[PDB]
Amino acid sequence: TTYADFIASGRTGRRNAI
Amino acid sequence: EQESVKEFLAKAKEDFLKKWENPAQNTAHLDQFERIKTLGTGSFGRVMLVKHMETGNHYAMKILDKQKVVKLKQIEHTLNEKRILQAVNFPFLVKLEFSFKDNSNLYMVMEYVPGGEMFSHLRRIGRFSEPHARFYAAQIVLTFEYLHSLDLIYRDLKPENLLIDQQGYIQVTDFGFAKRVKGRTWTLCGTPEYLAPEIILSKGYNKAVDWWALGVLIYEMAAGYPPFFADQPIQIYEKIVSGKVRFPSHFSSDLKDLLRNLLQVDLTKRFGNLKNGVNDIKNHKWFATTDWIAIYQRKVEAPFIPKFKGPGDTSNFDDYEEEEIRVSINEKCGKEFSEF
Ligand SMILES: c1nc(N2CCCC3(CCNCC3)C2)c2nc[nH]c2n1
Numbered sequence A: 001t002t003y004a005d006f007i008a009s010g011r012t013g014r015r016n017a018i
Numbered sequence B: 001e002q003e004s005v006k007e008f009l010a011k012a013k014e015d016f017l018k019k020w021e022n023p024a025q026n027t028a029h030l031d032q033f034e035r036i037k038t039l040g041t042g043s044f045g046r047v048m049l050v051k052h053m054e055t056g057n058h059y060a061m062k063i064l065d066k067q068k069v070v071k072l073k074q075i076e077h078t079l080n081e082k083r084i085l086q087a088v089n090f091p092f093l094v095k096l097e098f099s100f101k102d103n104s105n106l107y108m109v110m111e112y113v114p115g116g117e118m119f120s121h122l123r124r125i126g127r128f129s130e131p132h133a134r135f136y137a138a139q140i141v142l143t144f145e146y147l148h149s150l151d152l153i154y155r156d157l158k159p160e161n162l163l164i165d166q167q168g169y170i171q172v173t174d175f176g177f178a179k180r181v182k183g184r185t186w187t188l189c190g191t192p193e194y195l196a197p198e199i200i201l202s203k204g205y206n207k208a209v210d211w212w213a214l215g216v217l218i219y220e221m222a223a224g225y226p227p228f229f230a231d232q233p234i235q236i237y238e239k240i241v242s243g244k245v246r247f248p249s250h251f252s253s254d255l256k257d258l259l260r261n262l263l264q265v266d267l268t269k270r271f272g273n274l275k276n277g278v279n280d281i282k283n284h285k286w287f288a289t290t291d292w293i294a295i296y297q298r299k300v301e302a303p304f305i306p307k308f309k310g311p312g313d314t315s316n317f318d319d320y321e322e323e324e325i326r327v328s329i330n331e332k333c334g335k336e337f338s339e340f
Helices: A002-005 B001-022 B066-071 B073-087 B118-125 B132-150 B207-225 B233-243 B251-260 B294-295
Strands: B033-042 B045-052 B058-065 B096-101 B106-110 B162-164 B168-172
Touching: B001 B132, B033 B058, B058 B066, B066 B073, B066 B106, B073 B096, B073 B106, B096 B233, B118 B162, B132 B168, B132 B207, B207 B251, B207 B294
Parallel strands: none
Antiparallel strands: B033 B045, B045 B058, B058 B106, B096 B106, B162 B168
């Protein structure tokens, strides 16, 4: 599932500005 | 109806310009505050829970190292942040109570919002139901209507920059990328997941980037994950520039319709950017149950009330490594931050 793909990603924590 | 909004906005611009042209400066001193705990640390600097001894009030004090701001090329952005924040006044915008500087640092003392970040609640719960996301979305729609009427571009919308107050309402807390600009602007800034295609494509852009970021926020709140994500920012950009979005099967037809109009690559078609302006959003079917005045007046019952043990309680925030505030005997970057 998309939720399972998101949760396993490295981008679930606080995201830094660019 | 929109005449009352026009009148409201005209008096709001009058109040803003007086403060914009004549900014409050040096309104307190570091020694007036008792430093309690770090609430957060990042590119925004360090934010600490503080107690004002003369009143006993608690506040959130942002500390910025002047030398770090210089090395990071954030001088003008930091001057924009403070100039705008001290000038604005809206129910969903955090209040700047005091600002001052010393030899080493810049300080912004803001109202303490004890409910914690929307980000924390959103990740733990997984996702918000549509009525829950709509309640928060409505507050941002009014906030952007207020900001854009003052010629301000926000550029830093994300759950990590929205706090929940004791009454369950939103407080927008991050003005680091805010800018007063009448024409177009070109700075590459914001967060990968929230960037409009025109920012990624190095075009001159305008307030339409905030309406795109609202589309991103509504999707993430209702789905539990953003519309464009990948392990690397280059892969996120590739997804944003391609004109494709997929919605969870639980998304209502009204929600998908609103999100196709907000997450519109074509600027002549993006909601918030047309002849009817913000009314294309306010009058959309997904917002039919929203009473805009009741939201502004804070009369609507919030879907969620954060846990509040007492004054100074920090349970809604994560723990951070504490560092001592070191003030040099020598004034750093005096000229650069002269107007702060
Ligand atoms: C409580 N906490 C705050 N912060 C602690 C969490 C991280 C923040 C900076 C990054 N964006 C969200 C708020 C600053 C506040 N910043 C202003 N008022 C606040 N009240």
